[PDB]
Amino acid sequence: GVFTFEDEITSTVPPAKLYNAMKDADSITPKIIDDVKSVEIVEGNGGPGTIKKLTIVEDGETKFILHKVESIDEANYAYNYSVVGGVALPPTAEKITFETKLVEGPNGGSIGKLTLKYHTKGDAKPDEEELKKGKAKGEGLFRAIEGYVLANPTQY
């Protein structure tokens, strides 16, 4: 099954800047998110289809996550990736898709829509704590990208 969740967020950063930073997540995330150590491209050019391997630390243990870039829609300031391997995919989970879309907000900032698409095996539903964790991760990454732009104003 596929279960979809949307959350509306705001930023003081305007959407073209955020969107540009989002596309730079491979370099930004290991700097700001303590546990993310590295991002390696396995196949592809950064565009849709690209497979990436993230190396993280959890509890002093090195772990690996696999991502797939799904779609990048500049017209709607949209950047979509999926978690396709590693700890967030328990056996009844197939894939988790994290979509971010931005529009102009009032006061020269942004309104974002964070979509989480939790793909399960067969008739299973998402575990409640897994969903909570997934939403937190999605919002954390958004706030890492935003944090970077707010701390490095000249760069965007």
Residue among 30 and 134 whose Cβ is closer to Na ion: 30
Residue tagged 């760069």 (tokens): 155
Binding interface with Na ion (CB under 5 A): 30, 36
Pick the closer one to Na ion by CB: 16 or 39.
39
Identify which of 113, 85, 80 has the alpha carbon closest to the alpha carbon of residue 97.
80
Residues in a beta bridge with 9: 112
Query: For residue 39, how many other CB atoms are within 10 A of its CB?
Result: 17
Task: Annotate 32-78 with three-state secondary structure.
Answer: HCCCEEEEEEEECCCCCCCEEEEEEEECCEEEEEEEEEEEEEHHHCE
Q: Which residue is nearest to Na ion (CB)?
A: 30
C-beta closer to Na ion: residue 70 or 146: 146
Minimum CB distance to Na ion smaller for 41 or for 124: 41
Q: How far is the CB of 37 from Na ion (least distance, A)?
A: 6
Q: How far is the CB of 79 from Na ion (least distance, A)?
A: 20
- Cβ at position 126, least distance to Na ion in Å: 28
Minimum distance of Na ion from residue 35's CB (angstroms): 6
